[PDB]
Design a protein around this ligand. Structure first.
Ligand SMILES: *Cc1c(COP(=O)(O)O)cnc(C)c1O
Ligand SMILES: *Cc1c(COP(=O)(O)O)cnc(C)c1O
Ligand SMILES: [Cl-]
Ligand SMILES: [Cl-]
Ligand SMILES: [Cl-]
Ligand SMILES: [Cl-]
Ligand SMILES: [Mg+2]
Ligand SMILES: [Mg+2]
Ligand SMILES: [Mg+2]
Ligand SMILES: [Mg+2]
Lengths: 360, 356
């Protein structure tokens, strides 16, 4: 039928082959004559999937052997409280770098549980950039330093990651995990809801340095201890089996296209198509981010006034574009271009943007 | 290629729900996207989300003063979320112990506050539900918690106690919407979907609104999710979609009373087989407490137990091994397990007995 271009911000476009694969075996997985959704998570067919999803992630990001991969429910939002619940002990400080709204939500939850600090923030200038690492105020009693690698709502992104030795570096990578190569040993823990760049909603990937968190924390509910899930290999209680399966399928696709290094090349190219369009528009489109901080995953921009914003977004929706409205808290526009968004969608958006501009 | 799915969790689902999911997996509602590819703030998703709630409300006849929540973390997270929200200082989390899942819930409450055992059939290895006249209740109970169906032990409440000093709270993971319910008896009901309602990944929480908070993490407050209609953060959208589909199937067959008829016939097939076996098969539960959802039994010795389960597996039956904590056999016959599978089990049970 008509064209559909999926720029949804979360959940988001999946790679077609992962969906086609799921569709074909939805009723009979691995010749069991059952859906993967109808299997015991103690079955060997399921355990194979669970282990493969882990091994693909390990290979793709080159995760070291002293790290474990957890598959948890609850979203990144639950990690906002689980992290300080496990690591923010008395006399210690949850130190946060604020580079958008998701960073503030993480901070707020630690505030409920302990001493917090703000190491650096670009909030004053409306989160248009990543602060310089030299501005980071660090504390000897920091439990960790927490960052948001990709600021989904504001369209900014870390180009690289700080070297931190006094505390573990923790990162909310929900909207850019496995969009590029990563030196995992820079971190104590990485977490990501899967629904932005790794597949479906319902599972959260948590990559953790085992010895930072494989020990029982007194007074913490069993389900909320990392130790619980480390010890049980994310099978303490029933996992989100279809979500993990779909995650597996998406990881297979990333591997098939050449891994993190190849997908970064694709992601830089799609992003360039949109940013060049903005940059050649003579101010008709204005990107929110400063150029050195532009995200490769979420492109945020405004037209010159809200009336034009609305007409542009209404025209897009009529032409088949989905999800371009900016986050409700900031307005404007947001083109989410995660791994699986195809480049011809980006070209289509460029065409839209140029004809709208020329015809305005 | 015959397979009979007696898995205990996650479990068999209705074929029409899975076929419907398959057919539109790539193009949901003519959007040309999977339901999995939709924003949870889209109208497209929002209608599915609401439709799932509406079907539960209809099918269980849930009054207006109850809210229906879709949460992540399984029934296991509810074990701690409940006392986190309701077990305030100077109050008591009171538990009725009718199996190991009861025990797991009580354990989490003990982390957070004072607990109490209203009644327990543990001494007799959980062969029955205690007499409600036996309950020991406290003026300062924050709640009375029960497990409606004791998944590992094969026992089930026939009816529920009339409790007015405190909210009655029930872990209905393995029997929710397998029969009609009087929801007004409860302050809260919760269940992982993965037994009777859908795939794993979503937990249904039915809560008396005005019943349920300084210092609890935002995600762990019921009020967060009540206030945001379970859209505070990204919900498990595909699991809720599948839950909708399963609920449409239950509605289509005639609702909670109709599925109870089917379930009672399924259970009747197996229990009759056991009772007519002259002691060859022995059920764990006392008759008066027999579950309609998990039928637990053993052969006369461990070696016959093992021979039977091996024969079963060879013949395409899946999931009949009892829980590791108790051994024996367990036939889980949740809503979507078809009567034909129970008939097949019976026929295997009878043939095995003849050939022993
Ligand atoms: C989407 C997002 C979240 C929220 O994830 P949920 O799974 O909805 O809790 C948190 N952090 C970032 C950076 C996100 O983009
Ligand atoms: C299956 C079950 C649970 C465990 O549910 P999860 O979703 O695995 O946490 C809890 N209580 C009962 C009665 C169950 O049958
Ligand atoms: Cl942000
Ligand atoms: Cl977002
Ligand atoms: Cl039990
Ligand atoms: Cl069980
Ligand atoms: Mg491959
Ligand atoms: Mg194309
Ligand atoms: Mg219908
Ligand atoms: Mg008879």
């Amino acid at each position: 039928v008509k064209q559909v271009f999926n720029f949804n911000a979360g959940p988001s476009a999946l790679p077609k082959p992962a969906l086609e694969r799921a569709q074909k075996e939805l009723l009979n997985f691995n010749d069991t004559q059952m859906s993967v959704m109808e299997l015991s998570h103690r079955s060997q067919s399921y355990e194979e999937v669970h282990e493969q999803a882990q091994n693909l992630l390990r290979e793709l990001l080159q995760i070291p052997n002293d790290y474990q991969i957890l598959f948890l429910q609850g979203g990144a939002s639950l990690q906002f409280t689980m992290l300080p619940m496990n690591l923010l002990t008395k006399g210690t400080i949850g130190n946060y770098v604020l580079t958008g709204s998701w960073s503030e939500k993480a901070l707020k939850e630690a505030k409920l549980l302990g001493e917090t600090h703000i190491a650096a923030s670009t909030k004053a200038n409306s989160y248009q950039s990543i602060p310089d690492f030299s501005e980071f105020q660090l504390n000897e009693n920091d439990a960790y330093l927490h960052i948001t690698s990709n600021n989904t709502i504001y369209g900014t992104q870390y180009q690289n990651f700080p070297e931190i030795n006094h505390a573990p570096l923790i990162a909310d990578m929900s909207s850019d995990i496995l969009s590029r190569p990563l030196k995992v040993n820079q971190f104590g823990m990485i977490y990501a809801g899967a629904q932005k760049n790794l597949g479906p909603s319902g599972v959260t990937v948590v990559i953790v340095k085992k010895d930072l968190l494989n020990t029982k924390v007194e007074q913490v509910p069993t389900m909320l201890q990392y130790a619980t899930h480390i010890k049980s290999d994310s099978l303490y209680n029933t996992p989100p089996t279809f979500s993990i399966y779909m995650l597996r399928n998406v990881l297979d696709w990333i591997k098939d296209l050449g891994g993190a290094e190849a997908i970064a090349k694709q992601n830089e190219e799609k992003a360039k198509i949109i940013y060049d369009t903005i940059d050649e528009s003579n101010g008709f489109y204005v990107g929110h981010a400063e150029k050195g901080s532009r995200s490769l995953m979420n492109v945020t921009f405004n037209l010159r006034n809200e009336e034009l914003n609305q007409q542009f977004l209404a025209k897009a929706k009529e032409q088949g574009f989905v999800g371009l409205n900016g986050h409700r808290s900031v307005g404007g526009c947001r083109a989410s271009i995660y791994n699986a968004v195809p480049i011809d969608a980006c070209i289509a958006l460029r065409e839209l943007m140029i004809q709208f501009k020329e015809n305005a």
